[PDB]
């Protein structure tokens, strides 16, 4: 695989964005990974909605959290493949309450026609990646509350418990490490960004990886 990847210097990644009070995280790396495959696929980069997920996957419990996995099914099967615009059905749960689902009156941004789930190995994750894009992945993020920088090697790894995108690694570097976009804004670590080590299974990260299809 190449020795390192980073897919937002390909301008392939959406801005860092803000769950507010509320546990969409796995709405929010769902959507991220949407993004970006959709983006990879050959169309403009383009904001999708988190929204739609939170009030609409029932498979899933909004602000109580959910399953990556389970929003990519409920897409495909739910949804008949579609995402919507950010802008057509955007973000209104970030004081913790999720409106009721509506489906009139959102357009359509991307559309996939299923999920992979990734083996449970690190090294084939990052190859995976460099070729395909973007990872949504679930880790244990208890042990990030005063994260500001630098590459995590203690991560505590003991529950998975929140989801964010894989999107990028550099195996060359004295510690390699995994970049991972987080969804709790711009002010919180690497301008909104965690590097942990890559080859000891921090926070879990290897253990619940998977990707939308597009085409
Ligand atoms: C989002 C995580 S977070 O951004 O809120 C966060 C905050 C501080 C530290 C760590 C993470 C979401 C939080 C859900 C929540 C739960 C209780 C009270 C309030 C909010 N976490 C997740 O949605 C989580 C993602 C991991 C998916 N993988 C997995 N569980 N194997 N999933 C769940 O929390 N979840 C899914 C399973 N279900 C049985 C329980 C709830």
């Given at each position: 695989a190449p020795a390192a990847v980073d897919w937002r210097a390909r301008g392939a990644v959406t801005a860092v964005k803000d769950q507010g009070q509320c546990g969409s995280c796995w709405a929010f790396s769902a959507i991220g990974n949407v993004e970006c495959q959709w983006f990879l696929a050959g169309h403009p980069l383009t904001n999708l909605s988190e929204q739609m997920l939170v009030s609409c996957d029932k498979t899933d419990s909004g602000c109580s959290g959910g399953l990556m996995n389970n929003a990519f099914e409920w897409i495909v099967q739910?949804?008949?493949?579609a995402v919507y615009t950010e802008d057509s059905?955007?973000?209104?749960?970030?004081?913790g309450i999720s409106p009721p689902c509506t489906t009139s009156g959102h357009t359509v941004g991307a559309t996939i026609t299923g999920h992979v789930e990734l083996p449970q190995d690190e090294a084939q994750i990052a190859a995976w990646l460099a070729v395909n894009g973007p990872v949504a992945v679930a880790v244990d993020?208890?042990?990030?509350?005063?994260?500001?920088?630098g590459v995590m090697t203690?991560?505590?790894?003991?529950q998975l418990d929140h989801g964010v995108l894989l999107v990028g690694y550099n195996d060359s570097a004295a510690v390699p490490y995994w970049i991972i976009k987080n969804s709790?804004?711009?002010?919180?670590?690497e301008e909104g960004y965690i590097r942990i080590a890559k080859g000891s299974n921090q926070c879990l990260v290897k253990e619940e990886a998977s990707s939308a299809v597009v085409g």
């Open positions: 739910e949804n008949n493949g059905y955007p973000y209104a749960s970030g004081e993020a208890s042990s990030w509350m005063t994260y500001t920088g203690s991560c505590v790894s003991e709790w804004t711009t002010q919180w670590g």
